[PDB]
Amino acid sequence: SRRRVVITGMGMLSPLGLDVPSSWEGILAGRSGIAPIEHMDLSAYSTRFGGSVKGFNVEEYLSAKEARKLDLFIQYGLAASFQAVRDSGLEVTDANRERIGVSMGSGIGGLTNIENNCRSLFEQGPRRISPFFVPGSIINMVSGFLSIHLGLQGPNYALTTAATTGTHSIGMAARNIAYGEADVMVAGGSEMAACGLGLGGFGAARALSTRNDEPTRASRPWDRDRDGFVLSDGSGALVLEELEHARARGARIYAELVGFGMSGDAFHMTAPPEDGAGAARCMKNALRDAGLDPRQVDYINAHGTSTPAGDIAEIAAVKSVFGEHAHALSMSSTKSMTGHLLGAAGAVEAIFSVLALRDQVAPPTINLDNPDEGCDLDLVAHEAKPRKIDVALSNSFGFGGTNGTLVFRRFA
Amino acid sequence: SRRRVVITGMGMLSPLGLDVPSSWEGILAGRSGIAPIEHMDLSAYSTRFGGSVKGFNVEEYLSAKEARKLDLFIQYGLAASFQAVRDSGLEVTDANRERIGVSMGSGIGGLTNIENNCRSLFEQGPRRISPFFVPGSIINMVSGFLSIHLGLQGPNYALTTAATTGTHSIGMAARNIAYGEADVMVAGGSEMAACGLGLGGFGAARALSTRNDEPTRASRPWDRDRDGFVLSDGSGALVLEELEHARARGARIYAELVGFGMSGDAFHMTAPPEDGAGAARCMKNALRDAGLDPRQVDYINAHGTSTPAGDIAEIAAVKSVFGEHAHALSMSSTKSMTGHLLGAAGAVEAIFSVLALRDQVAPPTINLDNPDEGCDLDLVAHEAKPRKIDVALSNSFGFGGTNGTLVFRRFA
Numbered sequence: 138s139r140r141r142v143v144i145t146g147m148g149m150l151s152p153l154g155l156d157v158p159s160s161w162e163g164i165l166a167g168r169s170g171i172a173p174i175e176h177m178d179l180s181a182y183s184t185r186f187g188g189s190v191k192g193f194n195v196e197e198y199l200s201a202k203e204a205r206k207l208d209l210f211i212q213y214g215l216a217a218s219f220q221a222v223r224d225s226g227l228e229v230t231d232a233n234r235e236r237i238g239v240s241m242g243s244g245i246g247g248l249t250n251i252e253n254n255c256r257s258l259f260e261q262g263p264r265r266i267s268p269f270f271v272p273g274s275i276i277n278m279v280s281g282f283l284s285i286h287l288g289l290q291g292p293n294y295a296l297t298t299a300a301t302t303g304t305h306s307i308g309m310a311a312r313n314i315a316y317g318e319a320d321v322m323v324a325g326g327s328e329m330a331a332c333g334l335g336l337g338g339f340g341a342a343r344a345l346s347t348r349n350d351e352p353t354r355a356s357r358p359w360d361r362d363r364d365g366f367v368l369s370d371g372s373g374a375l376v377l378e379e380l381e382h383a384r385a386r387g388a389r390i391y392a393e394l395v396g397f398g399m400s401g402d403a404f405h406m407t408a409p410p411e412d413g414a415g416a417a418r419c420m421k422n423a424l425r426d427a428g429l430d431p432r433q434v435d436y437i438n439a440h441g442t443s444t445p446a447g448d449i450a451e452i453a454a455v456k457s458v459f460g461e462h463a464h465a466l467s468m469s470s471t472k473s474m475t476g477h478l479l480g481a482a483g484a485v486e487a488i489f490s491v492l493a494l495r496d497q498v499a500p501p502t503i504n505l506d507n508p509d510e511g512c513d514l515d516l517v518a519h520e521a522k523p524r525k526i527d528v529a530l531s532n533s534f535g536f537g538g539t540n541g542t543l544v545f546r547r548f549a
Numbered sequence: 550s551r552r553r554v555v556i557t558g559m560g561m562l563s564p565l566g567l568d569v570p571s572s573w574e575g576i577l578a579g580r581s582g583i584a585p586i587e588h589m590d591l592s593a594y595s596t597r598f599g600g601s602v603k604g605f606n607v608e609e610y611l612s613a614k615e616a617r618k619l620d621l622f623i624q625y626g627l628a629a630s631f632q633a634v635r636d637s638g639l640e641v642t643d644a645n646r647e648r649i650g651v652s653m654g655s656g657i658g659g660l661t662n663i664e665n666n667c668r669s670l671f672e673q674g675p676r677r678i679s680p681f682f683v684p685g686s687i688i689n690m691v692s693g694f695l696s697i698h699l700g701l702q703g704p705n706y707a708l709t710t711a712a713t714t715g716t717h718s719i720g721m722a723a724r725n726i727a728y729g730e731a732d733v734m735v736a737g738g739s740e741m742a743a744c745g746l747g748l749g750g751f752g753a754a755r756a757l758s759t760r761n762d763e764p765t766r767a768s769r770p771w772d773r774d775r776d777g778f779v780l781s782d783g784s785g786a787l788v789l790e791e792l793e794h795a796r797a798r799g800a801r802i803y804a805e806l807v808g809f810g811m812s813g814d815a816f817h818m819t820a821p822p823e824d825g826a827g828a829a830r831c832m833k834n835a836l837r838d839a840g841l842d843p844r845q846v847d848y849i850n851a852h853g854t855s856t857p858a859g860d861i862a863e864i865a866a867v868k869s870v871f872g873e874h875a876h877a878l879s880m881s882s883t884k885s886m887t888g889h890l891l892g893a894a895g896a897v898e899a900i901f902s903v904l905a906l907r908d909q910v911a912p913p914t915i916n917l918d919n920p921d922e923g924c925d926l927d928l929v930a931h932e933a934k935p936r937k938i939d940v941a942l943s944n945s946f947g948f949g950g951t952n953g954t955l956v957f958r959r960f961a
């Protein structure tokens with residue numbers, strides 16, 4: 138936390154829109170992006186719906202030749218990254234290209250491509266595997282391809298930490314800038330896990346909601362009838378920049394990234410401790426890194442995935458950290474609308490947290506019809522809430538008990 | 550680089566041995582770990598050999614019940630991690646468990662498991678996918694499972710940066726300690742990509758040597774008859790610790806981790822620039838981070854994968870960075886013996902770099918029969934070379950043009 142880090146560009150693909158403003162309009166209207174899945178036939182599946190990206194045209198970003206070599210998760214990551222870089226207005230030159238890097242991650246990476254190449258392998262043998270199978274499927278190729286396309290020669294890496302991926306990606310990129318390893322980073326995450334292995338894998342783990350009769354009502358964080366998360370696809374990217382660098386070029390600054398915290402639960406592979414102790418440690422770590430007291434937090438974009446154990450653990454953790462102030466802040470889960478974008482969740486939610494600061498509005502938790510026992514905070518049920526927001530937190534808690542929190546502030 | 554970071558424990562599985570001392574004995578003897586592959590039938594494949602872990606017994610580390618849920622790459626990562634923690638002598642308690650984290654990565658992750666679940670899916674449908682498919686296959690589950698088994702509640706994450714994974718994992722963990730986010734980290738990487746998709750995928754890219762008649766001679770870095778890398782499996786883990794913490798508990802210190810550097814080539818998805826400019830930037834970054842001049846480097850553990858373009862680019866980069874001193878240092882590729890362990894390569898090579906410091910010996914580049922044009926440095930051809938080593942560098946250059954360098958020093 139030596140140099141200051143601000144956000145100067147954002148980009149997104151989500152189930153609510155093919156860019157940031159379309160998605161945000163959806164969020165503030167309480168719109169659902171969840172529908173029956175169209176791109177595959179799901180009769181053997183217990184979950185037949187999810188949050189797809191609708192109408193994506195990769196040829197707005199890449200040639201058809203380039204695009205056919207890359208898994209969808211890479212296409213989505215590059216689309217968000219290009220949007221964010223364009224949004225920032227930054228011009229890459231010989232004088233600065235060594236100072237600009239990339240940290241775009243994914244939870245599961247190129248599962249569609251792997252499954253398609255596996256089909257070829259099993260039907261017709263190894264000679265039918267694509268030559269582009271490896272570089273078109275490995276998780277670090279969003280960072281790799283972005284760097285090649287834009288001539289970025291700074292730190293170049295990729296995280297994979299399940300639902301925490303996007304949060305880790307952004308926080309670690311911010312550390313690179315704070316410590317002088319880069320002046321600008323493109324950071325975030327992307328996911329497209331809606332293939333048979335993904336839907337079938339999460340379904341085999343009984344992780345997913347099975348509310349096929351009412352898909353838009355399936356994702357219902359903190360609601361007593363919740364029954365697992367909704368699988369969603371897309372990407373989010375931010376342009377993080379050192380403050381004096383941004384000021385010097387006249388950049389538009391959305392917000393300041395002031396804190397990043399991490400912890401491990403060290404408890405269980407998929408279930409949190411019921412008191413959310415690891416989440417509490419993570420949020421405290423983030424606030425201590427920001428030099429902020431818990432009483433200064435106005436809004437939390439929750440992890441809130443619509444799981445029985447997870448949702449109530451996060452309430453417990455918020456109550457532990459914030460004490461009486463827990464009833465003054467607002468906390469919402471935008472996964473009520475978007476579903477769970479896995480490795481992209483923390484990226485799209487960071488963008489929502491920044492826009493909550495820009496617009497002074499807490500996005501809703503839709504579908505919060507009957508809050509569960511102990512779920513008595515301001516969860517922004519049903520409808521967006523205009524309010525004062527100086528400090529916003531975004532939480533991500535992932536398989537393995539891996540936790541991350543980002544803290545954003547209105548800039549001055 | 551605020552607090553100092555030392556190495557207090559190491560662990561490994563490689564094609565040369567099931568622990569560090571066995572592997573190192575192999576390295577110093579110039580032994581090859583490469584052989585015809587036994588665990589699958591490779592008649593449709595143009596490459597039928599590689600570096601397997603021989604004789605691994607997971608039940609030395611895990612119950613059979615636990616082990617059957619985890620992909621081999623996770624089993625290997627946990628084995629190396631447990632070895633390193635035991636080697637360090639550290640006792641985990643309530644007073645320190647929040648200060649101990651994990652950063653174990655992988656390049657490709659659970660490809661064997663994915664392929665086995667894909668077979669089930671295609672023959673018998675999604676109901677035959679394992680419930681443990683997701684948590685047993687995702688890359689962050691080495692960090693996750695290690696943390697749960699040992700009660701580690703510090704920073705908990707995973708990198709995936711192809712051949713740079715292990716190098717990034719260790720350097721980023723060292724940053725967590727240097728900046729006060731942790732006092733101890735277990736860091737490194739693991740890989741088991743020798744399934745049909747892995748051998749077939751790299752073969753489809755024409756990335757691999759096809760010297761099936763002489764497998765032990767296939768990996769021949771800088772040799773004029775090189776024809777691609779040798780695919781290998783295994784894991785490496787280090788216990789990194791803040792220096793005053795190590796001293797206070799009477800730890801045995803192997804070496805100091807003094808520098809870490811990164812860059813991106815921004816050139817091509819799989820080929821480096823012929824002058825190795827990105828590698829040169831990376832090494833300079835690492836040395837500048839260490840506060841060392843190039844003339845202080847005694848040994849380089851090269852990336853040196855046995856590829857036509859890669860090997861000569863790394864020579865060019867070494868000549869650019871080191872000038873006349875390039876002819877005084879020793880540089881070797883231990884991949885001549887081990888083959889290319891992909892996401893574990895940087896981890897096992899960091900361990901070899903540390904042991905070069907401990908033992909004052911440069912490991913050989915075996916098979917360097919006829920050095921190619923311009924390959925006129927001290928490449929430690931054929932036989933290990935006792936010599937003075939105060940500073941050792943380890944390089945990793947990965948698909949996407951992602952580069953990392955670590956700098957180690959004899960400690961005082």
Ligand SMILES: O=C(O)CCCNC(=O)c1cc[nH]n1
Pocket residue numbers: 402405406407408409410413415416440442444446447448450451454534535536537538539
């Ligand atoms: O932690 C795990 O192993 C599962 C990932 C999901 N975790 C949670 O929802 C959660 C809520 C509060 N703390 N953690």
Ligand SMILES: O=C(O)CCCNC(=O)c1cc[nH]n1
Pocket residue numbers: 814817818819820821822825827828852854856858859860862863866946947948949950951
């Ligand atoms: O960089 C790539 O895209 C391929 C990975 C391999 N790169 C190299 O061997 C190399 C040697 C010097 N600089 N880079």
